[PDB]
Every structure is written in structure tokens, then in C-alpha cells.
Design a protein around this nucleic acid. Structure first.
Ligand SMILES: [Zn+2]
Lengths: 108, 177, 119, 71, 108
RNA sequence: AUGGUGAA
RNA sequence: GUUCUUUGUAAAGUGCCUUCGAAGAGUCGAGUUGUUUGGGAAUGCAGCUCUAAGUGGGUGGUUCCAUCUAAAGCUAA
RNA sequence: GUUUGACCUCAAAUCAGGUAGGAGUACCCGCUGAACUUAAUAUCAAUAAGCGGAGGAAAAGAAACCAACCGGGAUUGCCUUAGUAACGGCGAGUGAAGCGGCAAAAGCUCAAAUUUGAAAUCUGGUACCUUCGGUGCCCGAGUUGUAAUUUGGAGAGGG
């Protein structure tokens, strides 16, 4: 129960640089960044390459084909993977409507 | 590209998971109208290779056709008759039933400034492509017409009517040969 | 006799309205008197003057509307050109000339040269 | 038995059927057939006033220019 | 029945179009340098005729890039094989002669 | 035969 | 031609070394029932059941060979 | 926290931007589709008529091609191939295509190869400008993939 809330709170400290933050940084400027992973394509690319270290897969993805195969590949590669609910919260922490996935590599 | 895994999974159509998904989706569609809008295609792997993109202007329609002329072509014509302002870029089967077949059709909005300014996709804005489905210029229409290279399609390489006129219309020059 | 556009256009809206009212009254009087004359070029002259005044008023209204809608886009269709439906479509010069980055790079790398072949 | 038709006034509108046998009123598409060569000639454009179509050729020749002459 | 009563008019129109193209593209000869090809259909093998364009191997032997050959009025066929050596050598010599003869107008 | 018309 | 101008640790490619290098699935195809066709060994197309593989597959000529990479799209003459 | 904030679906606006009707139709692209006449079926004919959709041309177009030679090489159009092969009561009749000669030639764009050391993409609203559009800001779509190179004609990562 509380595990999902704690995981989301922890991920809230790895928020990807949103548009507003990017604009503020660019204006101020006018050691690579570390943040969670959201894009399914590059998340899968990191998978099968072992760059991924933690994976959460949305449990309510409408194209269930998009997520049926991910657990199998994660088990094959040994990358820690889990199922997660709350695609709305996933989108909120990713700064988008939804992402269907949440992976992390450079965990502090 | 993660879409390769999805395509490989879809190749084995007789899998239990795919059967479950198909039997759920057919029932879900049966509760909706014959033709309806879809927020996004259920087969992104098919859509991407057929040319659909997530940018604005593209539209996805789901159409049911009674089973028992190409069914894909009929569905394309039916959806075009409704979405007059849209151009039917492509279509593909997504589900079937004992008496009904389900097709997802991707169309482009030529009136959208995004498509108009997209050099890679602005070609469809030409009026020559108006009502593309009505002339069978799509993939299904070309397949039905049999316009393909090879001896098998020699007699219909350039349209049966055109070839008949060409081979049965007498031609005479100023100086007789 | 009559009126001229270059003179009418210099008058104000109220002056044009008053002139139109006076011309209408004169036209009505001439129509009433028509039954007592064999010829009446005066009625034709006043009718032409009324037509010119109405045209000037319409031009003033149109120019006022154009000034009101100056600069801002999506102006009323009454001001837009009526070239044809086929030309409202057929994407404009900018859209037609728009080119993709790959093609632009290829063209810049290998532009079409001009060359004579005699020597 | 027939009556004037609003679309054409040909006097071929059937009261008991509420339709015009000549122009197909109230059908959305005007009635026309290939076998009716004379009817096609009669109903073809140019037989009427052609209030707007007449100046289309002139506008095309002028190139749909806008503005006014500068004298 | 179709009768080619217009033959003379069509010839005149073709000549006028050729003249217009010559005026427009005066520096170029209105055609492209093309290879010498031996025909199939042994009935006509002894006959020697031109081809669509030079092969990629022929262009490489000539020592110019395919794109440069395209812009210098040299027709290149990317699907033609090289199952002969005499024809290859003749095409290479022809390409070298054409390249030596052509003069490129600089932007200066 | 094809497409339409009126109708005790 | 008047010449107005510029930039930007600018962009792409050539030759060698060099590590890699995914080929469009209810789709081809096979059987059946129809449409069309003078279609060569019912082809082209549709309805029906099945529907396969990746140094693999399609079309042809002698068991072996030759030739291309479909099931996505645009293009004046 | 029996609120509240998000996502997805369905509705309302005489809100803003538009789009489709029809006519015309000699030529084009598909569906449907007869009859007389002839040695239902070959033939007439995949013509007559009907239906739907485009332009000044349309379609097609850069091979899962043609060929069996020391091979060619987009589509399209003309002479020839040819009244031959082939089909067909082998009769009556139907009937092509490679090659050869000429007109004109131009090939390209994606699914595909993390940009992850930075959704960098794009639609729309407002303030300006030098208004077939450009800039500042805002808003929205988009991670179920918008950016870039690239499609075996290959191509990419480093020296
Ligand atoms: Zn009428």
C-alpha cells in the first residue's frame, strides 16, 4: 500500500528537467545530468544492454502488447523490474501526460 | 527499436495472449458504432510503418464491415464518405469476428498547418490526391487493380480499359506503312 | 451638373448622408413630375449621382473596416481575395517551397552546376 | 397534374409524388443522363445568364490582380 | 479511328521545346553522358548500344563521387552489373575523356 | 436490353 | 552586374585502418467457392479454413542454377 | 484527505480557424453492367447504359523486373516485333510481350541503428516587424516517439 507512495515520493527527487527548468537554466547561462527514464524506446534500448538498473512498468497500458514482453526481457537480462499502478502519477513525475514506463540507471 | 519486439509477438498470431486480446477487443468494439474515432492506433508497429505519426493532423478511425470487392477498399471508401475533409492515407485489419471484420484506417488532414508545412507529408495536400480512396490509389486499391510488375500482370499493367482501348483502337499515319 | 468621385470622397459621412437624402428627395419629386414631361435627363442625372454617392459610402465603410482589421490576422472573409476555391487550396509559395533538412543538406553538398562542353 | 418547380420552373413537378421529372427536384443531384443528348445540351451551362462564370476567364487572363492602376 | 494528321505540328512543337530547353540550360548539352553497353538477346548481341548510366564501380574507377557525377551531367546506374571487362574499360576511358573535356564555370 | 415518365 | 554582406570551436564527403550492420505477417503462399480473362499447367481479383522463415524468400530455365528483395510512401518530361 | 489534484472516456457552445456537398464530364481512375450479331458459353464485350472520385492532363513510375547471352536496367508514347508465339469445336475467330529503332530522362522519403551529456520537435493564442511570413511570451499536442543521420544504390560508431 504505502510502498507505491514511497516509491513515487523517491522518484519525485529524480524529476526530469521540465521545460520551465530548461528555460531558466538556459537564461541563467546566457557533470552530466541524472534523472529517471521515461521514453519506452530508449528504456528498451538500455535494456538488453544492461545500462538500466531499475524498471517500473505501468499496469494499465491499453496496448497490453507493449508491456507483455517487457517482463520477460527484464528477467532474461537480470535487470530489477516491477509492475506499478498510477499512470497519472507516473505522468506527473515525468512531466507529461503518461509514459507507461519509469526506468533509472544512475541512482545516487 | 522496441517495435521490433511487438512485431515479432504479433507474428505468432496464434498465441494465447493475442487470442485473449483479440477476443476482448472484438467484444469491446461490438458495443460501439460501426465507424468511430480512436485516440491512437492499437497497432503502433503497423501505424509507424504505414506512415502514421504522433504529430497533429493525423486521425485514426475504426470501422466494422459485415462479413459474407476488397473489404479493406470498402472500409476505406466508407470512412472517406464520412470524413470528406480527410485523406485516407492507409488502412489495416485489426480484428475479426464470425460475421464482422474490424479495420483501423489512418487519415491525414490536409487543412492542418502542420501537415501543410511538413515537406515530407505536404504532398497529400495536392488536390490530385482528393478522395484517394475513391480511385483505389491506396495499397489495397492497387492490389485489387493488379498494377504490379511482372508477366502475371502484363494484361492489366496500365488498366484494363486503357489497354483494351489501346489494342482495339486503329491508328493511321499520314503516309501509310 | 452631376457629382464627381474625387469631390465626394472629400466630404464627411454626415455630409454624404445629407447629400444622399437630398438626392433621394429630388429623385422622388422628379418621379412624381415624370407624368408631365416627354423627356427627363434630369432624373437620370440624379439617379447616377445617387449611385455614385452610394458607391462612395460603401467604399468609406469598407476602408473603415479595413482600418479596423488592419494588422490582425483572420480578418472577415469579405475583405479576402475571391481568386477561386482551387487557389485558396494549393498551398501557398512558402509551403510549396518548404524543403526537408535531408534534401536541403544534400542540395547544399552537391549543388547543380553549370558547365559547357567544347574543350 | 404537374406544377411549377422551384429549381427550374419547367412545370414538371408532380403534386402526388412531390418530385420534378425534369431536373430531379428535390433530389440533391440534378437529374442528368448520357442518353439524353438534347436534354444535356439544353441544361448545360451557358444557356442562362452566367452572371459570375463570364468574368472568370477575364480574371484568369489578368492573373487575379488586386489594387488599382497608378495612372 | 485515330489519324496522325498532326505529325508536322508535333514535330514543330518538339523542336520548339528543344530550343526552349537549350535556351534555359545553354551550358549543358540537354543530355547526359551514358555508357556503352552490349545488348542481350544474342540475335542482337553483336550490336553495341548506349545504356542508362554508368555503374558505381565504373564511377569509382573514373575517380569521382556518384553525387558529383550526377551534378556534372553523367548518368549513373546503381543496379547495373560488371560481368565484363572490355566494356568496363571502354566506359572508364569515355568517362575520363568527358571529365577532361568538360569545363566547370566557377561562381567567381 | 439500359435509364426515366404517367397510370382505373 | 549594383554589389548588400558575413563566422561558425559552421555542416557534409572522399581514401585507408577499424568495430558494427535490423530487410514491411491474417502477409506471401497452399486448398476451396465465386468474378474477369484468348491468361500459357484458371492466371489477375474477392468470399471462405489454414497460413508459414530469416545469410531467408519471390520469378523463371534444368535434380540444380540465373535473377530481384514484395506485403510502406512521393515524384515534371 | 467521505475533500482536493491528475489521467482516460462521453457530451454542450448562435466560442476561434476551417473543410464536403453541386455543376461540368471529350480525355482519366474504380464499382456495377446488358442486348442484336456471330461460328446461357468462345464471340458481341469486359462495349451500350448506371453509380462514385480528380487535373490540365490522369494513371503508372524508379523492379521480390526483363532475359538464359562476352546480359540488360523507371514509367510513359510511336515503327517493328505481329497478324508471329499463344489461345480457341486447332475450325470460324481472338491475340499479346522481351529484344531492336526513336521522343523525353531525375530519382528520392519512412518503419528500421537511445539525441538520453539535456522532446532538443511541432500545432494554436497575444505584443511587435520589413506580413504567401519572422521574433519575445503564453498555451496545447507529443515519450503509445515529435528532433538529427540513414534505407543493402546501403549505412553507422572511433582513428
Ligand atoms: Zn425542376
Amino acid at each position: 500500500r504505502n510502498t507505491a507512495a514511497e516509491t513515487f515520493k523517491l522518484f519525485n527527487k529524480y524529476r526530469p528537467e521540465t521545460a520551465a527548468e530548461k528555460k531558466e537554466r538556459l537564461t541563467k547561462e546566457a557533470p552530466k545530468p541524472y534523472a529517471v527514464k521515461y521514453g519506452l524506446n530508449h528504456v528498451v534500448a538500455l535494456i538488453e544492454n544492461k545500462k538500466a538498473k531499475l524498471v517500473l512498468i505501468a499496469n494499465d497500458v491499453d496496448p497490453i502488447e507493449l508491456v507483455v514482453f517487457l517482463p520477460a526481457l527484464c528477467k532474461k537480462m537480470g535487470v530489477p523490474y516491477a509492475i506499478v499502478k498510477g499512470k497519472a502519477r507516473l505522468g506527473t513525475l515525468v512531466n507529461q501526460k503518461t509514459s507507461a514506463v519509469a526506468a533509472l540507471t544512475e541512482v545516487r | 527499436g522496441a517495435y521490433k519486439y511487438l512485431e515479432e509477438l504479433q507474428r505468432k498470431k496464434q498465441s494465447d495472449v493475442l487470442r485473449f486480446l483479440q477476443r476482448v477487443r472484438v467484444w469491446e468494439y461490438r458495443q460501439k458504432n460501426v465507424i468511430h474515432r480512436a485516440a491512437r492506433p492499437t497497432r503502433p508497429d503497423k501505424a509507424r510503418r504505414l506512415g502514421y505519426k504522433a504529430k497533429q493532423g493525423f486521425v485514426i478511425y475504426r470501422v466494422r464491415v459485415r462479413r459474407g470487392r476488397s473489404l479493406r477498399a470498402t472500409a476505406e471508401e466508407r470512412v472517406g464518405r464520412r470524413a470528406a475533409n480527410l485523406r485516407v492515407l492507409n488502412s489495416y485489419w485489426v480484428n475479426q469476428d464470425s460475421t464482422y471484420k474490424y479495420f483501423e484506417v489512418i487519415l491525414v488532414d490536409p487543412q492542418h498547418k502542420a501537415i501543410r508545412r511538413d515537406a515530407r507529408y505536404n504532398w497529400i495536400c495536392d488536390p490530385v490526391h482528393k478522395h484517394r480512396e475513391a480511385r483505389g490509389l491506396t495499397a489495397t486499391g492497387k492490389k485489387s487493380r493488379g498494377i504490379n510488375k511482372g508477366h502475371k500482370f502484363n494484361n492489366t499493367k496500365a488498366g484494363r480499359r486503357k489497354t483494351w482501348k489501346r489494342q482495339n483502337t486503329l491508328s493511321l499515319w499520314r503516309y501509310r506503312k | 451638373a452631376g457629382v464627381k468621385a474625387y469631390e465626394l470622397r472629400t466630404k464627411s459621412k454626415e455630409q454624404l448622408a445629407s447629400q444622399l437624402v437630398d438626392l433621394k428627395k429630388e429623385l422622388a419629386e422628379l418621379k412624381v413630375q415624370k407624368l408631365s414631361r416627354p423627356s427627363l435627363p434630369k432624373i437620370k442625372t440624379v439617379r447616377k449621382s445617387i449611385a455614385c454617392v452610394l458607391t462612395v459610402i460603401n467604399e468609406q465603410q469598407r476602408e473603415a473596416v479595413r482600418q479596423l482589421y488592419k494588422g490582425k490576422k483572420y480578418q472577415p472573409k469579405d475583405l479576402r481575395a475571391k481568386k477561386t476555391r482551387a487557389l485558396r487550396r494549393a498551398l501557398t509559395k512558402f509551403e510549396a517551397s518548404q524543403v526537408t533538412e535531408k534534401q536541403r543538406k544534400k542540395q547544399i553538398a552537391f549543388p547543380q552546376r553549370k558547365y559547357a562542353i567544347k574543350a | 397534374s404537374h406544377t411549377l418547380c422551384n429549381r427550374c420552373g419547367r412545370r414538371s413537378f408532380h403534386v402526388q409524388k412531390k418530385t420534378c421529372s425534369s431536373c430531379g427536384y428535390p433530389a440533391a443531384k440534378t437529374r442528368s443522363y448520357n442518353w439524353g443528348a438534347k436534354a444535356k445540351r439544353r441544361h448545360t451551362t451557358g444557356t442562362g445568364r452566367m452572371r459570375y462564370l463570364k468574368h472568370v476567364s477575364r480574371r484568369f487572363k489578368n492573373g487575379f490582380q488586386t489594387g488599382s492602376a497608378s495612372k | 479511328v485515330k489519324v496522325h494528321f498532326d505529325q508536322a505540328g508535333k514535330k514543330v512543337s518538339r523542336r520548339n521545346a528543344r530550343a526552349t530547353r537549350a535556351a534555359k540550360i545553354a551550358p549543358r548539352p540537354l543530355d547526359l553522358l551514358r555508357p556503352v553497353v552490349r545488348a542481350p538477346t544474342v540475335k542482337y548481341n553483336r550490336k553495341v548500344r548506349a545504356g542508362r548510366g554508368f555503374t558505381l564501380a565504373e564511377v569509382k574507377a573514373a575517380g569521382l563521387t556518384a553525387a558529383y557525377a550526377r551534378t556534372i551531367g553523367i548518368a549513373v546506374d546503381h543496379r547495373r552489373q560488371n560481368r565484363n571487362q572490355e566494356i568496363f574499360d571502354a566506359n572508364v576511358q569515355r568517362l575520363k575523356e568527358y571529365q577532361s573535356k568538360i569545363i566547370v564555370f566557377p561562381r567567381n
